[PDB]
Design a binder for this molecule. Structure first.
Ligand SMILES: CO[C@H]1CC2=CC(=O)O[C@H](C2)[C@H](C)[C@@H](OC)C[C@H](OC)/C=C/[C@H](C)[C@@H](OC)C[C@@H](OC)/C=C/[C@H](C)[C@@H]([C@@H](C)[C@@H](OC)[C@@H](C)CCC(=O)[C@H](C)[C@@H](CCC(=O)O)OC)OC(=O)/C=C/C=C(\C)C1
Ligand SMILES: Nc1ncnc2c1ncn2[C@@H]1O[C@H](COP(=O)(O)OP(=O)(O)OP(=O)(O)O)[C@@H](O)[C@H]1O
Ligand SMILES: [Ca+2]
Ligand SMILES: [Ca+2]
Length: 361
């Protein structure tokens, strides 16, 4: 045999076995060292954070710390999945526009450190598209650290048209802390950040129209929701519920001058060959945890419709599984009969070295 699928994100690792419906292990992408054992990984590092210095080896989707990434992978195999990686083909994921040296190092580590019999690296957005049951479309993938638009045709990403936006879930969490503090609460500490992340994931939503929603919130309590803090205090969340994710559509709310996600989607489509643009408009797939806000699909449909030609058929696909669709795509790909010739084998590695990844992946 059974292949392993490891989707390594800025915030969370999603890992499991090809053929499972969902990842067995989902844990924070963190390694902590004493300010016992020599290091801790994942939730244990999080729970023991008070006595550790934490490192986050994936930044904006890119692996930036190889010693700590090795610790994350080792923890995934040995602790979380209870597998010997030398016994399983292993499929890893990577960010769009991942540098060649980076994919080489991933490959080197899998074969030399973990002794895998075979491996493959796939682009996260491409896997998400596969999970949606198609090979052509444009993915908006938004996680904890980065957002990308990735147009894909007949299974392959179109690098010249990929858009990267360094605004994602962590920025939204921080903004929600800020605006709840402005309301008169105080959310400033590291523990309070975790609480506000929960508030964000439970109560936020994307308004179909920002102004209408602000007006409703100003003139009634109909949008207000209660939230109980760990210690039992009950607070009220009002327009913050939709003001937080509104930032995706209007990054200026946090002082970023970037185009919002509807505009980046349009701009990415317009970088592609005119002949495939209708295929992209008709197959906008949302992926990643920061696309989980209720209302986001209807809002994207509205905004893209306003930008596109009047005759254009537009469809937003926002699967309920989209927190884990990258992982699911890896699972179905690794399981597919026609994929089995595509693995990089140990022999292929021994006879080419790490740069085999550019040819095979
Ligand atoms: C219940 O499990 C679903 C959950 C799910 C997750 C998600 O993110 O999206 C939703 C479903 C979808 C939006 C969905 O919702 C209900 C609607 C989707 O509508 C088209 C229906 C999907 C069905 C599950 C699927 O039935 C198995 C429909 C089927 O239609 C004929 C589609 C088959 C596709 C051909 C297939 C391919 C895209 C993948 O094949 C496994 C893909 C890995 C192929 C990759 C290539 O061809 C690469 C170009 C080549 C090189 C790289 O790989 C060798 O695509 C599939 O077989 C996709 C299967 C997906 C699942 C089994 C996941
Ligand atoms: N229901 C929800 N509503 C809003 N945000 C959510 C929801 N569920 C999870 N998130 C957010 O999604 C992010 C995690 O998503 P994901 O696992 O896709 O990111 P990642 O792969 O770790 O990061 P990246 O793709 O940026 O490298 C977090 O910021 C989390 O708070
Ligand atoms: Ca991700
Ligand atoms: Ca702006």
């Amino acid at each position: 045999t059974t292949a392993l699928v490891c989707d390594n994100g800025s915030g969370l690792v999603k890992a499991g076995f090809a053929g499972d419906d969902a990842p067995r292990a989902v844990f924070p992408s963190i390694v902590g060292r004493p300010r016992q054992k020599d290091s801790y990984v994942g939730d244990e590092a999080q729970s023991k954070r008070g006595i550790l210095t934490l490192k986050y080896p994936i930044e904006h989707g890119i692996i930036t710390n190889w010693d700590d990434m090795e610790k994350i992978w080792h923890h995934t195999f040995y602790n979380e999945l209870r597998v010997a990686p030398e016994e399983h083909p292993t499929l890893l994921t990577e960010a769009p526009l991942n540098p060649k040296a980076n994919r080489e190092k991933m490959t080197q580590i899998m074969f030399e450190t973990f002794n895998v019999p075979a491996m493959y690296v796939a682009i996260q957005a491409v896997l998400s598209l596969y999970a949606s049951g198609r090979t052509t479309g444009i993915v908006l993938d938004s996680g904890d650290g980065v957002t990308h638009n990735v147009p894909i045709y007949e299974g392959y990403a179109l690098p010249h048209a990929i858009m990267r936006l360094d605004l994602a879930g962590r920025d939204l969490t921080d903004y929600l802390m800020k605006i709840l503090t402005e309301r008169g609460y105080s959310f400033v500490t590291t523990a309070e950040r975790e609480i506000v992340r929960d508030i964000k994931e439970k109560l936020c939503y994307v308004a179909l129209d920002f102004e209408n929603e602000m007006a409703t919130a100003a003139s009634s309590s109909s949008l207000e929701k209660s939230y109980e803090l760990p210690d039992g205090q009950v607070i009220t969340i009002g327009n913050e519920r939709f003001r937080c994710p509104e930032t995706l559509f209007q990054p200026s709310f946090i002082g970023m001058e970037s185009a919002g996600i509807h505009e980046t989607t349009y701009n990415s489509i317009m970088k592609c060959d005119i002949d495939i643009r209708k295929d992209l408009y008709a197959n906008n797939v949302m992926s990643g945890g920061t696309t989980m806000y209720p209302g986001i699909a209807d809002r994207m449909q509205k905004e893209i419709t306003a930008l596109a030609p009047s005759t254009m058929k537009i469809k937003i696909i926002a699967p309920p599984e989209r927190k884990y669709s990258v992982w699911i795509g890896g699972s179905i790909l690794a399981s597919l009969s026609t994929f089995q010739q595509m693995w990089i084998t140990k022999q292929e590695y021994d006879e080419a070295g790490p740069s085999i990844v550019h040819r095979k992946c």
